């Protein structure tokens, strides 16, 4: 394919650092400037929740689905490149490149695999998500909710497993974010599909001289050398070691809910609910908190993890800057 006690010592020693969460996040995509919250959310998608199966009452998904939405030139697609190369298994694809059959499975009498099936247990990166038709996007409802694919065609009828995490990229209606429309109307996905993402990010091309000088200095510094040694930050982890950390934490660590975490989750859900938050906001909060716990090599979910899960959800969709009644965003607060 393309362990030792020293590796365990290194992993345990790194896990004791105070700046661990920021260190890991800024190290998944070293040359990309800022976008810290986006990097953090992607890191938690890499770790994932915990998988659960009951004797009866079913099984519950550990995987996280993320949507990146916003202005052009904001470097969304560049981030999808890093995720596609970091993940052990996965696929990158485009909206105009995909059919309903190609995305799931194909009759040929034999059955054949599509992208979401090849990507099982990994991450499936979908770019230009706003270009594919309502017919093709309707296929994703069942696979995202259940993590299974049911088929019933001439001579073949069966169900297949798809433990696949989706990372999506799109631009708003009108192709540049319009502040005179509410956020849900700018995003323009129908509610049954928009309800299935754990995190939704707004990223905006806001002009600012302070930001622009730093961005310009960062991009122009890459052309001072033939094959650059330069990198955005002094301390980042090598890709190999980072992969080792993530892989080990996925295999050995399995956090559980503490009573304290249960009380905070109930309180937080009632807070978002009483005023719109659906029942899926609760489950996605649980899943994000579990992902945060694995990343610290803990066996228990605690109050700190729940509060981080809540904070990241509020930060992603620019809620603090949102008018609570009209649903428009004040660009001055960004």
């Amino acid at each position: 394919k393309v362990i030792t006690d020293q590796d365990l010592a290194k992993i345990r020693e790194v896990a004791a650092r105070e700046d661990l969460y920021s260190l890991l996040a800024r190290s998944i995509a070293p040359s990309i400037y800022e976008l810290e919250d986006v990097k953090k959310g992607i890191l938690l998608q890499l770790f994932g929740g915990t998988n659960k199966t009951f004797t009866k009452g079913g099984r519950y998904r550990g995987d996280i689905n993320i949507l990146l939405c916003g202005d052009p030139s904001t470097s969304k697609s560049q981030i999808l490149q890093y995720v596609h190369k970091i993940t052990p298994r996965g696929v990158y694809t485009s909206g105009k490149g995909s059919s309903a059959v190609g995305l799931t499975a194909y009759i040929t009498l034999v059955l054949e695999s599509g992208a979401l099936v090849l990507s099982d247990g990994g991450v499936c990166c979908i770019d230009e998500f706003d270009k594919m038709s309502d017919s093709t996007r309707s296929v994703l409802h069942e696979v995202m909710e259940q993590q299974t694919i049911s088929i019933a065609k001439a001579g073949i009828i069966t169900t297949l497993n798809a433990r696949s995490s989706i990372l999506a990229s799109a631009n708003p209606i009108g192709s540049r974010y319009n502040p005179n429309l509410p956020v849900t109307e700018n995003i323009d996905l129908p509610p049954p599909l928009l309800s299935r993402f754990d995190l939704v990010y707004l990223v905006l091309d806001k002009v600012d001289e302070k930001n622009d000088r730093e961005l310009a200095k960062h991009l122009t510094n890459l052309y001072l050398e033939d094959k650059p040694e330069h990198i955005s930050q002094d301390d980042v982890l090598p890709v190999e070691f980072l992969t080792m950390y993530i892989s080990y934490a996925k295999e050995h660590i399995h956090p559980i809910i503490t009573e304290a975490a249960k009380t905070e989750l109930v309180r937080a859900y009632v807070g978002m609910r009483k005023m719109t938050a659906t029942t899926r906001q609760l489950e996605s909060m649980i899943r994000l908190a579990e992902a945060h716990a694995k990343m610290k090599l803990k066996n228990v979910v605690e109050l700190e993890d729940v509060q981080e899960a809540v904070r990241l959800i509020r930060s992603a969709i620019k809620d603090y800057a949102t008018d609570p009644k009209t649903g428009k965003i004040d660009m001055n607060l960004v």
Binding site: K56, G57, Y60, I256, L265, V270, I286
Partner: protein
Amino acid sequence: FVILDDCNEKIDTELASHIVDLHMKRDEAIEPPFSAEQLRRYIKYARTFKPILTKEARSYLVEKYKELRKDDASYRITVRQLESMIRLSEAIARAN
């Protein structure tokens, strides 16, 4: 059957607790009245009954159907609703 969110704090506070319990304990939360292998044996037994419509029930059915027709006078209520109501009553008697 039409399902609606109907947001209410007194329901949300309980529903959230139920959901968090399912993620906190795997098997323990549900505590059903019967075992599945018990329930299937009961359902197999029940389907052997072939109940018969009582005289008073025949008199009562036309009154209830007239009430539905006057409510109707929304999908328009046809003779098929009476036939369906008879089917449901057969199933209810069989359940008992």
